[PDB]
Amino acid sequence: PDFLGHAENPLREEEWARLNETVIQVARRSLVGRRILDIYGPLGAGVQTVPYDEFQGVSPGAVDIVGEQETAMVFTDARKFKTIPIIYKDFLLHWRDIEAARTHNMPLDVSAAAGAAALCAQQEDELIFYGDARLGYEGLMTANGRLTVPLGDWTSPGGGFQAIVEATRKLNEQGHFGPYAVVLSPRLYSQLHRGGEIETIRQLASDGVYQSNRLRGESGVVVSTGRENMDLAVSMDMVAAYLGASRMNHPFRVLEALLLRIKHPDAICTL
């Protein structure tokens, strides 16, 4: 009877919940980007633009008896106010499946939702680690002033740790001493486990050495985790929305509004 009309809320609160836990757990296991960087608090659905800050140059601070140095970061001559994109994916649910779940009193099948959420999280990781290049957004691998460190021999056990060291030294001379987070391509990430080197890299980082599929070829980035160097503005988190109905089925969209803003471009170091 309910499926005879274009239904407003086809699912009741039980399956809406079940969908919410499904998406939240799938994404939570899937995500590799959020772990690297702290999110900026939830602004809301209305917010679409946030102040994009740049802080080129270093003002490490002052020591004084009388506090007269007057040091203070300078705002960029023109605030750019970058806009917040939308990351989304779509999945179908069959009306016969919904009614079968309702009459059977059995859990509803949300495999399509889990797949859509995993793909949306993967696309989020792509946006974080690489710029859109059509929207004009700036990624970790496309940022100006990436502090490229050459990668010479890499398979001898000393070399892998040495390259991370040298990247740390570059960050040191550029002014960032904060905790380090290391993100590696799958190839060299798996390779690094040959000599137990991964634990040493993790200890040097002190915040986590993780692996991302999206990085292609050799790809290691060391990034000061701290706020005021990189941030993730969240307008609205992972949600599921109902895209009307067509052909009696029920399309839905896994949705999130994220923006990665690199406040200080010298806080990252690619290989």
Partner: peptide, 11 residues
């Protein structure tokens, strides 16, 4: 009725 971020940051 607040924002209530859903998937909390791992950090």
């Amino acid at each position: 009725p607040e924002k209530r971020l859903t998937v909390g940051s791992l950090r």
